[PDB]
Design a binder for this molecule. Sequence first.
Ligand SMILES: [Cu+2]
Ligand SMILES: [Mg+2]
Ligand SMILES: [Zn+2]
Lengths: 307, 308, 392, 248, 267, 151
Amino acid sequence: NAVEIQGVSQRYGSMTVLHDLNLNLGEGEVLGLFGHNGAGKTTSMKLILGLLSPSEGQVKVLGRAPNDPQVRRQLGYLPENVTFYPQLSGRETLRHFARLKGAALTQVDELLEQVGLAHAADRRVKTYSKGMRQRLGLAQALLGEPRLLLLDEPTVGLDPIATQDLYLLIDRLRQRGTSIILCSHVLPGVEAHINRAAILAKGCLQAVGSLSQLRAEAGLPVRIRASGISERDSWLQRWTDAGHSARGLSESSIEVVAVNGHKLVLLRQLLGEGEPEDIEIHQPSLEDLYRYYMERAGDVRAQEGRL
Amino acid sequence: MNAVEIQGVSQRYGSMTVLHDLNLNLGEGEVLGLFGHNGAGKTTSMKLILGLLSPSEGQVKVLGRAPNDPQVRRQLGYLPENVTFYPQLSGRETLRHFARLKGAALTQVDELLEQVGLAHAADRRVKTYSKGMRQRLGLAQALLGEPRLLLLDEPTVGLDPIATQDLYLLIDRLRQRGTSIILCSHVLPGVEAHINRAAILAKGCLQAVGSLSQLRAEAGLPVRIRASGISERDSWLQRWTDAGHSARGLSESSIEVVAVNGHKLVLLRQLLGEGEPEDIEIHQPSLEDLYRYYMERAGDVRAQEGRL
Amino acid sequence: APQSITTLPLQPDGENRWRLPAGEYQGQFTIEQPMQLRCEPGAVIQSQGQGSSLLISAPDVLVEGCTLYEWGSDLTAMDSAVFILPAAERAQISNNRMRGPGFGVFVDGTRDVQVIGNEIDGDAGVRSQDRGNGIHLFAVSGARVLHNHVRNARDGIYIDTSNGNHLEGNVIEDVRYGVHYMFANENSLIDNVTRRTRTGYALMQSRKLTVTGNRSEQDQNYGILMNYITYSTITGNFVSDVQRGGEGKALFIYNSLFNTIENNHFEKSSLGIHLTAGSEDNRISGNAFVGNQQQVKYVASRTQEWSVDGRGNYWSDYLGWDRNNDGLGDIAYEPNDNVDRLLWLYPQVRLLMNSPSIEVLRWVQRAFPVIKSPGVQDSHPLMKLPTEKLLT
Amino acid sequence: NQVWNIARKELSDGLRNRWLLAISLLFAVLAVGIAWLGAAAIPATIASLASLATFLMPLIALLLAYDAIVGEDEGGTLMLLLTYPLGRGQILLGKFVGHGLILALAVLIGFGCAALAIALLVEGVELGMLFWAFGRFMISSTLLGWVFLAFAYVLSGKVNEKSSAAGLALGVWFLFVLVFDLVLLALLVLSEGKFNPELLPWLLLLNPTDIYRLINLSLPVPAAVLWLCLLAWIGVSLLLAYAIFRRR
Amino acid sequence: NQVWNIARKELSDGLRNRWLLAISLLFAVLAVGIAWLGAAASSIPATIASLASLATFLMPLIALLLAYDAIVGEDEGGTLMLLLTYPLGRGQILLGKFVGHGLILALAVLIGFGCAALAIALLVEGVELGMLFWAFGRFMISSTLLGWVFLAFAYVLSGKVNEKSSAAGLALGVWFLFVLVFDLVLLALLVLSEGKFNPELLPWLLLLNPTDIYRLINLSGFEGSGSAMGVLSLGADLPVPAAVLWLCLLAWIGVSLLLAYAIFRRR
Amino acid sequence: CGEKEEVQQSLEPVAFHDSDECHVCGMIITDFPGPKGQAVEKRGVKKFCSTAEMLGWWLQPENRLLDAKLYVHDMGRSVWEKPDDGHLIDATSAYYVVGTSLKGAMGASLASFAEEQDAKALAGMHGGRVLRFEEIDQALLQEAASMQHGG
Ligand SMILES: [Cu+2]
Ligand SMILES: [Mg+2]
Ligand SMILES: [Zn+2]
């Protein structure tokens, strides 16, 4: 139980920009925080880091106080955009953060080689790209065995081989027993790696739980399409016998929106007649689940091309 | 009719060729994706399509003309990455500046500020705008006039999760009208639901071109089938392994099937015939996984346990 | 050359006193007997244009009220109007009108002559090289030239090697030099007024003399020129508006070693005072340097204190304060910069004189005193005008 | 013409600069405060106003346009603007018109408020000479500013970052105002046997701040060559800026 | 200690600033050039009032070039919000920046007045070496204190603003006001009132400007002439001794650091 | 060649006229006895009523740097009351005698010579000392003029 937020309803300016979020985070889970209209996304970020005071509620990080120095050596925070110190070098920036966090100096040369930055080490930060600064920003987050990562969009401005390898580096730290929070706005791609999502909107934490739970608590159509079908004309109608509208947009692109109540017999319809090649059960993704819970609180569906 | 006809160019700076033997043909309504990692070929190809550079060993035919005619650029939107406009100007005055240059009518400025959803923050300075608020402004200048080709270099960076899906709904409204656009992104899940045909390119060359059904067919990549309690984990681990598929031995009540997609046509009949399909998740090899394969197809030895 | 007895003088009193009636006369005239001759106001003694008109050879003659006209112009033979011989000691020349192209009053070798109240209009057409002197004095001891009116002569009141004599209250207008001094040791001149003159006061090689209370209205190019004067005294002079025609200097001190220069008023000229390099360390205190476009021109690097007994001069551009209420200022006043002497040392800096770099260099001197050359400063300058009476 | 559509942007963007409006207020106050101490204490005060407008009108021009090209490249709009129907000449000439009319207005608030303190606080100024001596002053102060505007386009197009552009705009302002004439003074007072002083009226023509004062101080050369030499400093440096802007 | 670990950064960040090393070498090459003219003129009270005038223009300039972007350059750079999630306080990352930037000014004036002493002991023959070390010992430990005043001034105007482009405008305003505007308003108050505004309050207005308290400390012994002081001639009317002028210079740090800390505490 | 051409005009000395004012005292030059110095500048010729008034002008710091030729009279080949214009020697290579009872125009009487024996003739005939041009300084001009026209 790493992050135990309990009863917190943060008020400032008598505005009440956060309300009653009870966000318990497990000791090995990877939570995700996604905020749109609500300012909860940034306030809760601060609240766990300890640089904000919880009015009317308590935040318990690692079972202890959030502003103790003994727990703040075990955190890691990758901020939004950190152009660190443009005249300093790569080693000298990370040795500066190693001296502050109390980490041993033998970690600095083996974190600039763990992150792919040893070729660009001993070079000034003004000669770094945005992706190399995100590489350096991750390197101070893994400084001195942190038991709680807290990443604020770690994969922005980053090339996709390093993006896929970052989540493999995250998957190393999940097995080590370190809880990670992935607060992002680039929601397709993070749904394969988090364990529990937490969509909070208009202050109130709307939905929390795993991805299998959020599809159970929200009736959304599952999109089975079978690309490369043999016959297409009877496949326009043969799914509608149990109420699954087999609507297609191409020569064979029948994205059958089902109801999640007849999943045996529609595949018995699919496998009883006609052979498939590559079935595509397209689950309602984290992009589609987000716009249901957003619409359920305050949002009304935007027009045809009007955002 | 093809919008962009890159016909065998080879762009070099000195002796080094930063873009070698690129051969594209973007269609009349297709959404193409220029993805690059080691090479600077992605950036140079962008410049060649626009009027910024010249092909040193080839030719480009944008909309049936040279890319630097004024009749071409009046129907050509281009949103660049990380743009920060003139911060002392207002949001309406910035688009009214850009409407005067492209020759677009001044009655379209209040429409496009309404179309991208910038009506509340219009007549405010650009310095008091967010990062995603400037992306709505940067998208809005690309839609000025009646454009026939859009080069969205990273359009959804720093954007709200409603507004990114609303952006792609504006894309499929645009490509039905007949303007073939180009997505240039780096977050590969998310672009993969709307890209018509990928154009993954390596250091020098162009690796692969074609739709997602053609990239998965050419590059043999295994399907990632995950389930949870069909019958039993240990009773279902045994079946795919004689047929030539990997069955991962997880902890409890989970059946992960990595099949080789060649014999699984009739093999999937037995999974329906003995249990319910009520909790499965079949994952196709994604655009992220195809792009990691083509980096292994030319260059780029794989990183360690967790390295990069 | 006829004589004064060859006229018709009607005697008013029988003590060798004669009176010429109204009516014109002709030719030169000569006095050989001690006659205190007076004249009616219509006694126009008009000579023909040659020779000295009224030559005087007898001592103790009170010539009064005559009106002389049109004498000679040969300055080499000294064709004067009133020639006074060395034997004509203690002559009084009172209230006369003269108009003619030569010397007005030429005296030489005389003692105690009194030249009082005359009006000598010199010329109009001669090129100021043959107009002759107004009141020429040539080596006389004891003279008293008072309250005359000399106009349009050449070089005004010329004085050559004359020791002890007073020049009191005479108005000198439209001439080349106002008062010319040549080797006049222990002289004196009080309250003279000089108007529209190419040099107001020529002080050449005359020591130990007193120059007091004089006024110079609108002179050209030289207010008071002093060459080689020692132990002099310049107290109360009013020098106003020396226009160009030199660029215009209210006081030009050239090789004058010792002199006390107090209570003067140098007003509205282009240069307030020009101090040459040879003339240094003399008591200059209490003057009023108002309205001049440039106060001191001192092309040197030697320091020069301009305040005796702790009292300095009043300067119009003195932007200083006085906290403790005495008459003196609190901060010292340097009238010249270092770039204010680069203009004088090198005339090509006049092209650069409006540049910001020169305006930078004026500010660097006020902040960094190491680059300040030792100039012509005065500790304790005055705050108010000391010459409140000299403006009349 | 699109040279005006990009000029209307630079008017609206330059006039909202708080850095510019701070200097134009201090230029208009100090042009009155010198003229106030030039009346109570007209060619004697127009020379001290010429030394004032040699300080600030290069400084106003370098404050406007040091980030004209490289400030748009850092903003990313420079790569966007070249994909529009726009030449590289029309961007530079349109920025030169837009930034040019700013300091052509900054002398109309600068000397327009200075001539109000002269025509109404002298009482006998003989204003028929005023509208010819200030017409010669306001026109020649813009042309001094248009040289350093074209100097600012040279240093902006050469550099690749905004921080080193301000390091060069300070270097151009130091060299052309108060280093070129100080090294003329050091070449006078320390060298006279190998420095011909007759050559020095022609060496003032290599400095547009020096040509600015010579047509406000009325010399072997006439006045009309200095007008044609000040306009030649615009025409070469704008052509130099166009040659640099075509090599990005 | 945590206050020293962030001082070692700023000691290694100011020394890579090329704009500092230009104008701190300018302080060294002018302190040789001023002291060379002070040797050729022999003069002694003019080279003391000119060296103190050189450090009036440059030791506030190096201090405001260092620390105008000390807090707001880290806030908009993103690295300030990260730094509070380290085991630190807001009092340690300000006092640590004051120690780190303070040793740069302790080296920028030890280079400047250090090489100025070698252009006197090797230039003017027969100077008093005991009086030279005492005069340049008073110049070294008081130009740091003038530098530490404007260092603490720069933390006030960095915590208050939220944009670095507006911090450079305010830091230029602080450098213009305290150096060469406060000396000109006080001059114009004495000229236009002819010294009759207040004959006893006006010497106490020199204590409201730390550049003038800096000039009053070094001009204690070498008064010399009268025109060397200029507007500093009111310092003879100040009844305070020299030791209070040191403490009024230290009080200009301690109020302008506690103000800088209370602003940063509610950032 | 530029320095030589400017020299090729400065070297010639203009003859004195009756309408010639001095540069310093401004009065008519040819109304006086004694030698009369003059200064050719090559931008404008300025003349002096006496040689001691020329040397008083030369020792000012405006004219120390001024490259201008100084010309005085040769009193070894001329009568002292009326000096001609024919022979006008260079003033740097002359032999001025000092302290004679001769009556010059403004300063002390500095009779200039070119042959040094005629300069030694006038020194023993009046009690003076011959001296060169470079020994002339402003402590000597004011001392010698005070002994001539003083006491
Ligand atoms: Cu004379
Ligand atoms: Mg005072
Ligand atoms: Zn003369």
